[model samples]
Target chain A: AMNDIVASTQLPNTIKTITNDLRKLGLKKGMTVIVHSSLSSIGWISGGAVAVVEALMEVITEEGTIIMPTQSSDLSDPKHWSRPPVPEEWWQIIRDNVPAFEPHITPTRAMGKVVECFRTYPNVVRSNHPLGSFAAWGRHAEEITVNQSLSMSLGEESPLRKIYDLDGYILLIGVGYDSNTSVHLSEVRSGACELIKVGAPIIENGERVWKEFVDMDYDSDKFVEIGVEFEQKGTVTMGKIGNAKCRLMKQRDIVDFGTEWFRKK
Target chain B: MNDIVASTQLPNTIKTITNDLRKLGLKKGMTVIVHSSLSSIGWISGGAVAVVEALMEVITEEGTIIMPTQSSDLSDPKHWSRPPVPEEWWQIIRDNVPAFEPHITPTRAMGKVVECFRTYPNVVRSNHPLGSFAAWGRHAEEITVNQSLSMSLGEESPLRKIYDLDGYILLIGVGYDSNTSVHLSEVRSGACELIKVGAPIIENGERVWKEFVDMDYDSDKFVEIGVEFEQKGTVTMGKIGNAKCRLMKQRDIVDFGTEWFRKK
Candidate 1:
């Protein structure tokens, strides 16, 4: 009976392992890192959501900033919902009822706990937009988040453009190219990228009002496909952290590759 | 291995299945890009030939019917996974695989009916080496003509022309994963990421191995995209023989999918 005791399950990934992996993946010191992640993909983490930000902080150091997408898709029009879309009868009411995007109170949906955790972390400098907002902390957090706009979610106005200007690096943890926010800046630069309309509730003069804006509608569907070929051009350095895939590369290289890619076949 | 079993082992005939197709919303002379799995339709009397006949009968003479006559085997071997070959065989096949001759070449990996459909009487095949399309009936030539190799399924491909013509897709037991038009939509969307692919083809009066980067033909999000579309009452759903089926407007799905892709 004593010998019949079952062994414990695999242990959660440690912060040290993640730091080591990021280092091997070429995340440099004092580098600006924009991350998109699926934390669970790294197997179970010892500290759950908090450790991911900590790991990123440890890897990039205090001089470097860590940026993560914090979108509140629930604030979007219900007509666009497909994961169990509401009836048409409720579309107008739902759009009317959606709370104004409050960076302090609005929770991130579909972006996962790690990003939401970062969004909620103390002193996190988040943009004011309802649907398209990014959270950051470190040296350039203020510069990146300053002058956030309603119409430009992914163009020269967004934090992504600032990251590219600062010569930051993109770090996709257990995610594909589709989540690489910097490429959208390239799409904006192309001038031929498709545009669509999106509406969200925003705080105007302490009053809740819905505002509309053009969405670049980033399609990451082909990211892994595009990224595979991009790597062939020596744009990315790859590794693994905590059983999760990792890619680290310069922001400018990805943007340039995307610009050339969109204009041509 | 010999005892491997599948549930789609039912018996069927082309004539019988064609009737089911009509009931499932297929009609005379409507253009369609059909993705089929032969075994899913049960057994046919004349096999692939009968399946082709059934399709032809359902669509009639005036309507165009198209199939992805892609020689996927002519692509970069580094991407091959199904029935994968050794690393050495990849280059060897690329070096030796014949340049596609529309009338003579066969559709690789696209099921028996598609292979037969490509060679069926009066079929016009486009010129894309890896993603060629074979079409018959009215509007066939218009859709397949000027098919640029670089735009495998982009705005210039047959899918866009089909979209312009208000065509539909016949997914006979095939999932959204086989829906090719979505890729066409992605190419036009801002989010369409760039991907590189290499293949052997005939260009400028000579055979050359062309390497290029273009939009990725991704269907991973099609299922979700389609679900949203279906909710808007755009898709017509039914069954044809043994396969669960769907017929949807190309524009509605692609346009809506593009709109949906941006906000999130």
Candidate 2:
């Protein structure tokens, strides 16, 4: 049964009407929907986050996944502090206190019980580079793409790459099309020449050799360029209802499905 | 020794002047300063909690004790689920996944810490039954005052009858004189009138017991009025030199033997 739908013809109720219209887009159970949200567009008076989350939950029911990217790009390992050099002991202290620091460097999982129901998959796959654009889980592929960096090589190991590989559908909650999650497309076109090929580095563990794989550089620009061309030519239509914008990813549109399937297994 | 001091001479240098003022304030060891913030008084360029905390920290060193009250007078158990119901939990969970849930009840501590280093003391001391005011501290007086409502009568509890026996000296940062921590002085005065006595039903484990105690109804109101009287009477005086507003406790003020202590 659908919740009671209240309507008004007033001009001031434009935001409410648009939000209700977006709510009308049914979210089926078990579907992974990646969301790109623009909170400001949704005006005041129309129930804020409560109404939005409730409406989406009603549509998705119990078997849906909701994810958002909560990253702090300003955070850097203190060992790498350059200018106004920090003392070595202070750097060690910083490293030791990282886990205990408040406003912790973990992703925002504020949805409480709703998120608790759907397990947040362990292991956020990120590039070893400091400048990597963080991506979060979602049902939509494009939602993961838009909030990423311009550099393809830098963003290769990002969670957005994983979402793209999953061929996830994207649900744009009050956002424009230019906020696209197509960094790989851009990477492909730019010839991916700046791609980094990382390798395992050996470290001495108190007289024992310890091998660890580190971020390296490679020349995979040609592959990325081809991927970009394919995406530009691809016709991906989206659903426009009320003021909601969302794009569904088709099975055939999945380019790296094989790689994802193997990795997921 | 002071690190640096700059004079503001030109109108064009106001931005630089303000920045320097903030920098000079924040230059050294940990300094505790209380603030009666008028949100609209200053030009706030940023609204994020992190930005606000950082700005305040810049005025005090990183180890500075910065306290903000997150008190909600509406959330007293006696007034729970009242008209404008608590909506922070529902709203935060829905929209901003990263945002913290606002506290329903007033604790001496404000919202969660936005940065690392600063810590808010638990247990807020308030004089009113319905509309409460809280001060943040781990002092014996603060802890006793906060827990006054919960103690058993005639049991020699630490919080018993202490409201009328204590005084607080505020280190006001940016506020009108009316925001002084003078509520306890009013409570002491009101207890003189046996007319302010009321029996409140306090919960004792599985049983509810009606306890008779002096009701300080106009505590906060009286404090506000007394502050106005003091300001008009020219009783308050302050010095500005090192870009820091230091508050000496009443005992310390008396010990210093300064002429500033003799004001009304």
Q: How many residue pairs clash (N, CA or C atoms closer than 3 angstroms) in each of the candidate models, in the order given?
A: 4, 24
What shift in Å separates residue A203 of candidate 1 from its native position after superposition?
1.0
How well is each residue in B1-264 modelled by candidate 2, as lDDT tens digits? 011111211111123323543443433233332433312112111112232344344433322333333232212222223223234433321222111112212222222222111222232333332223333333434323433432211113222222222322333233323222333333323322322222222243321222234333232343334344454342233422222233323223222212222232
Q: In model 1 chain B, which range of ten residues has the least summed lDDT?
A: B1-10
- Best-matching candidate per TM-score: 1
CA displacement after TM-score superposition, residue A109 of candidate 1 (Å) = 1.9
lDDT of 1 by residue, A108-218 (tens): 666876786576555678987788788998888889887877786878888989998898888888888878877877777776456778888888887978777787766
Candidate 1 wrong stretches, greater than 4 Å: A1-12, B1-264
Per-model i-RMS = 28.6, 15.3
Predicted structure 1, TM vs. truth: 0.48
lDDT of 2 by residue, A1-265 (tens): 0011112111212323434554555446655555555533443322334345444544544454444443322233444434323445444333322221122222222222222212222322222222233333234423443444323423444545555555545565555333333333333433433344221111234431212223323222333433344346554445543333454443224334323322343
